[PDB]
Amino acid sequence: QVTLMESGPALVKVTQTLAVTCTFSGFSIRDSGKGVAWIRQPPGGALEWLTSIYWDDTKYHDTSLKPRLTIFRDTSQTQVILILTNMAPLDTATYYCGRINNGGGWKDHIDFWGPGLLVTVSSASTKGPSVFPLAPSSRSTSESTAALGCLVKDYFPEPVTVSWNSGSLTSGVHTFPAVLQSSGLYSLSSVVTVPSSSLGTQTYVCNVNHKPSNTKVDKRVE
């Protein structure tokens, strides 16, 4: 096995409207308090449940937000969905859907949670990435003691991610959380372990991908 996914837009504009979708293994089983939910967390904040739906379209709603939200599906299309009001940028968050399994009608299970969505809000639109290899001009190490990678810059918003020869050379990795580039953009670093003296007998590749532009690009580290 069981896994969940959610997906939607990578950015929303200031006072526009979000919409999102959620699909899964575990397909529409009518099990032990079985349902699905939507949850969000403010930037670095606590968790917040929004809403959920069960083994028939019995469905339930937050008191404080109510008109701000609405929930349904086309059962045949096998996505759970969520639809919302127009947006104040504070509604930016880590958002997730999740699976429910509450017993005979009590006792909590949210027994699976999806990889989530980077729901992000600004008055501005998307901007695409610039990528740079980082290997230095002068060198002194020997053997597999070294590590190298690529910078990413000038994009907005996140996510961007990196892989090492389509996963095939993944070892001794470091990855750093991205930082706001002070013009109102973002920047990222990720690194992989390498032989200090044997670059070019094999090639080490930054496989960079950026969802908002859907830009995917491969560059040599050496």
Binding site: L47, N102, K107, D108, I110, P115, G116, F132, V179
Partner: protein, 206 residues
Amino acid sequence: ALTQPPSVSKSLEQSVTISCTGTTTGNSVSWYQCHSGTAPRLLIYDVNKRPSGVSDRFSGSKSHNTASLTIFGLQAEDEADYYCGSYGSGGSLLFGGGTRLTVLGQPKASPTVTLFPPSSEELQANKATLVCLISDFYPGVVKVAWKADGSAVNAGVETTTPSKQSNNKYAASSYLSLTSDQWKSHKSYSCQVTHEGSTVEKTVAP
């Protein structure tokens, strides 16, 4: 929301006790945790019931209103934020503010550090960036300093607060930025961590 304490700190050998409070009914509170930047993880269910096949050190337990969570043998990796979750009126599912955990007596570890020079596609645009990477340290403390000759940090002070790795060690990065002529006219190209006051330095050269 469900009220709980903000933060908990204890020795690495010690079986820590955590609690959160059910505002109503309470006797079905599940537990979950939040190691940061990532999807959360399931803990105890029903009441006291052990989740199937996840790490066995997290301790099934009960209370009537002060719903309670614990660890058996505490370990360094357990530094994370911990949450209560509840049924409530008509499917009003309720949730806590979190509680952070710190695992004292843990050694710490001195920074692993790396520095990289600016790139040709910056030099074509009169730009330059030095990329400083700070990693493998403990506790989650950092400050950072630079020596682009005698000059202060320029064109992006852009530096992370402390962040956790895959292991219970911590990391950050910094991006001192210049014009290409500032890069060519300077000659010292150096970054220094000052983590817990410890002097740790990297430098680049043509």
